[PDB]
Amino acid sequence: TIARTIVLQESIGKGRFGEVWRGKWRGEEVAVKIFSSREERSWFREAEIYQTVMLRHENILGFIAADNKDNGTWTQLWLVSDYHEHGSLFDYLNRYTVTVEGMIKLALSTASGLAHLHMEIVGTQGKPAIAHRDLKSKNILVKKNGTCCIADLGLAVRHDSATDTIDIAPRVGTKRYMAPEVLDDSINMKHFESFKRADIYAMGLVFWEIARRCSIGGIHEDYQLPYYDLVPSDPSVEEMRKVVCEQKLRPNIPNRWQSCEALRVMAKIMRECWYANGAARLTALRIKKTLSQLS
Ligand SMILES: NC(=O)c1ccc(-c2nc(-c3ccccn3)c(-c3ccc4c(c3)OCO4)[nH]2)cc1
Numbered sequence: 001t002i003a004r005t006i007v008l009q010e011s012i013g014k015g016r017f018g019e020v021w022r023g024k025w026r027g028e029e030v031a032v033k034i035f036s037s038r039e040e041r042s043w044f045r046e047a048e049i050y051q052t053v054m055l056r057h058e059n060i061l062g063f064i065a066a067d068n069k070d071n072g073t074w075t076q077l078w079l080v081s082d083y084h085e086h087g088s089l090f091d092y093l094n095r096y097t098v099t100v101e102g103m104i105k106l107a108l109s110t111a112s113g114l115a116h117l118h119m120e121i122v123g124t125q126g127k128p129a130i131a132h133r134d135l136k137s138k139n140i141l142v143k144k145n146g147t148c149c150i151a152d153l154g155l156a157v158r159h160d161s162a163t164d165t166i167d168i169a170p171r172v173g174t175k176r177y178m179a180p181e182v183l184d185d186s187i188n189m190k191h192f193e194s195f196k197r198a199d200i201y202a203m204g205l206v207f208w209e210i211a212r213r214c215s216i217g218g219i220h221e222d223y224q225l226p227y228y229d230l231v232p233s234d235p236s237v238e239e240m241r242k243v244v245c246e247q248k249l250r251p252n253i254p255n256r257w258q259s260c261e262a263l264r265v266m267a268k269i270m271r272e273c274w275y276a277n278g279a280a281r282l283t284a285l286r287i288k289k290t291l292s293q294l295s
Pocket residue numbers: 012014015016020031032033061079080081082083084085086087088138139141151152
């Protein structure tokens with residue numbers, strides 16, 4: 001009664017695996033991600049993460065269902081979610097500039113989603129702490145109300161806090177957004193907090209992307225991906241490692257950002273997400289608090 005009743009209308013892009021469509025379910029727009037039979041492990045793992053108890057949150061993509069659909073020749077494996085017409089934060093930031101208010105809304109909601117992912121909720125209906133492992137502007141979506149929600153949870157890892165163990169055996173993710181310790185393979189992958197810290201580094205890069213598009217008095221920067229000035233469009237681990245680990249460079253913080261308090265606060269958050277030492281980085285909770293006070 002899920003897949004059977006949905007009609008696909010428009011192809012809207014690709015996932016890591018799977019094809020994303022705009023579909024209609026009981027007259028409503030939904031997003032459908034479709035995987036083939038040979039991608040069952042990917043589909044199942046993403047279904048599993050989205051079905052985590054107590055996961056739902058305004059800043060996490062709203063999951064509707066996992067399902068199968070047999071068309072008479074082959075079986076499709078479906079994930080169905082809320083639909084957000086703006087699409088990704090990447091798309092949004094390319095299309096638009098934002099106000100100071102708009103920037104803070106995007107950054108705060110992103111941090112709130114990540115803080116929720118990262119947080120263990122204790123109790124009978126307890127939520128394990130979860131780290132994303134591939135956070136970037138392309139997998140954060142922008143809702144009609146101008147807030148963000150986090151998607152693409154297929155690479156996520158979940159923590160059992162009593163044993164300090166992780167639910168799968170984990171260099172995944174997008175090379176451009178990989179933390180220094182991921183790039184140089186020094187990350188201790190038996191340590192769950194290390195994955196949280198790596199997510200924070202990537203969120204700092206996303207905040208830089210947003211801040212570039214904050215237009216004050218007609219003044220703003222063009223849209224760029226982090227490290228656009230230092231690496232090729234599809235960089236290798238080695239190309240990223242030489243920049244981030246060896247030369248110790250980070251995205252440049254424009255001078256015009258010091259002239260505005262909101263932009264100063266954002267720039268300071270970025271610096272404190274970009275430390276080479278993960279243990280020194282801000283937590284998502286702390287970032288949320290700081291942006292909430294700013295909002
Ligand atoms: N570049 C990446 O690594 C990447 C980027 C994006 C995805 C992705 N997944 C979905 C999605 C997920 C579950 C169910 C439906 N769609 C969606 C999705 C969900 C809702 C949407 C959408 C895309 O566009 C309009 O509303 N995007 C996956 C991987």
